[PDB]
Symmetry: none
Subunit: 151 residues, 6 copies
């Protein structure tokens, strides 16, 4: 009859306070953080990791709407990249990426892997209203994603 | 021409040095860290998060072997739990499971969800040679897993 | 001018990361791998070959110290055997050997070529603190050795 | 332009490979080596010097935890000693000590400067779980510490 | 009595079948594989290692004849290279080489260390009728060598 | 009684003989070595390490006089460098320095971080009569410093 479940849930109940108290927004199972600073892609991921998150992914399409309409009028990094090999893309969190449906989320003609002035290709993806591969060294803001068993 | 890919690599290169320099061991795409201290399940996860990792998962069975022979004669936390709801288990990183082999790796009669004296059920999993659900407040060592596009 | 090299170096520099990332230890020019599993002598060699190595040899005596103190309290296969002809021993990597120097490394009364209960002689050598010829079918751990032009 | 920094970074990037390839472990700025052999205090220091290091020091307390939990259940020399004059201790690397701190790391009643059977006092410090001054001629293992501008 | 030598021989007897079944040719103690594809020097070596071999060496001169007349009208990598230091050559398998009988095996004016159009020197050796150092990035076929106690 | 302190002192007494026998000069607690050859900054440091020393530092100003008048009419490396980040200087031995101090020891307009012809900045310091940051690849002589509990 000694139910310490109150304490267990209390611990989770507290964890989400720290998140929303730091302006993490909840959406369909995950917590998302839209950054206020702008940093490179690698530097952006080091942040999401420090906060136990990764650069957001897209398991669905309505998820992209949440981002886009939250980042409409804004370029925000995400967790896609084809560094290791120029051909294959892959999410940094672990999600395998359904190349099939991943179409439409790219710009009308994208990815292009454009050659930038400072001798860089494009191996990192950001979002304004559809994805665009970009030079990773460029300092954009970003969005982290975090999973929870909380609803 | 002017290819900073040398600079791009060099950076990833460096990232892996920091890992193995802190005794992260590589195995089939991911890096694993076997802790030297012992802490509760959440405290163990707060650590793996701090290092941009999560408590190891099992996408395969040969993966579990790697753990076992590195954790043989040792109980190590992992990222499984049926906390949110007592029935459903789920990995903390995101990996879906449930046959999904998800079997044989448990003890001969496990999980049992035993009722501990002070004063909790069992909602966290560790490994000695096969999984066992355990009271989360208990301070065991753990194993983190980290993804890379490096091989 | 245009000096790749780096790309060269970069390439060699990467090769050693994969090794130590898989827990290969460096010693006086060579890389050594001390196994975590236990397998027969041939199965141990099939592994060392797959990883571009062979079961360690002894060009020197200080080398044996490195092994012994790394495998102290442990029986580890090595690349010696007199299978082809029961009299002559020979290293599997290619190194020619001199029983002259190879003496002292054997037990006080060794090799013995003992007859085991199963119809095997002893044609394979392992180490605890000094060599002992052993039945090859027996599943001991092992040590591989790998050469490099890296220091 | 023509920037050899790569080459400069490649040089350092190589230096750390040589270290971890020989089982130097990184911790909060420094590299630490936990020996596999056991030797006297001076002989232990002659080694750390040969490898451009000195017998580990303790600028902090979290450092001692790193040592202790890597040497837990193990006696390891360190770079403290009161030879020159029996009263004052001093680190061999150069680090100044004698804080109101530096206490608590000792046994319940330590240092004692015990008189050993082979006419030796105790002028050297080792660690099992807290410091103890010891006869320097005694052959313990040791830990070296090395500094770097690498993180 | 119970003589498992039949099984021991059968295993060796089987090992050579897999080799010649894959077109490994025997010569004076060793097995040699002449590749059907063409790959760089490093890519070529990863193959020979995977197959428990190394890029062929020359312990003798009649060995070179076997290679040359098996590859007459063909450029084949071999296990020589002066990568580590531009001056010293060394075999990748381990064989030390007198570097005094080595003369005669080189082209009439070789090695030259020619500067190629792409920013590479020549640090790898192939054979047409006598050795020539070559740019390692160049995609030639190759020959592996494997040792055995079989005759 | 049986006081092996004679043997203990004799060992230290021997260490200093080896030093001055190799022309190490004593000054206010430390031993200094002024090299007879000239080598790069890194090559110079590898030496001081081999001799259980590091490139000299300056805890005081009267110390600098000893160096300057011992190296007057001579450029000698020291253990300062602003590698890692172009801004911060730091001693290679470990000494934190009186950045508030450390002025006056530099040239009238120094450091300058001049851009050298072979694409190098200046990240290493030598001394003629006052400090000057210099290209590390340049081969100057040097001075090592060594600590002792001997006076
Ligand atoms: Ca790309
Ligand atoms: Ca683009
Ligand atoms: Ca449960
Ligand atoms: Ca249980
Ligand atoms: Ca035998
Ligand atoms: Ca035997
Ligand atoms: Ca004392
Ligand atoms: Ca004592
Ligand atoms: Ca060459
Ligand atoms: Ca040529
Ligand atoms: Ca500088
Ligand atoms: Ca200057």
């Amino acid at each position: 009859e000694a139910v310490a479940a109150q304490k267990q849930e209390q611990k989770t109940q507290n964890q989400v306070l720290q998140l929303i108290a730091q302006n993490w927004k909840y959406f369909n199972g995950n917590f998302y953080y839209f950054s206020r600073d702008k940093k490179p892609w690698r530097e952006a991921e080091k942040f999401c990791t420090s906060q136990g998150a990764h650069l957001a992914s897209v398991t669905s399409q309505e998820e992209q709407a949440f981002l886009v309409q939250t980042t409409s009028s804004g370029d925000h990094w995400i967790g896609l990249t084809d560094q290791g090999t120029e051909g294959i893309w892959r999410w940094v969190d672990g999600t395998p990426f359904n190349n099939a449906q991943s179409k439409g989320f790219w710009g009308k003609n994208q990815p292009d892997n454009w050659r930038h002035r400072n001798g860089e290709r494009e191996d990192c993806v950001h979002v304004r209203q559809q994805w665009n591969d970009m030079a990773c060294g460029s300092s954009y803001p970003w969005v982290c994603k975090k999973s929870t068993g909380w609803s």
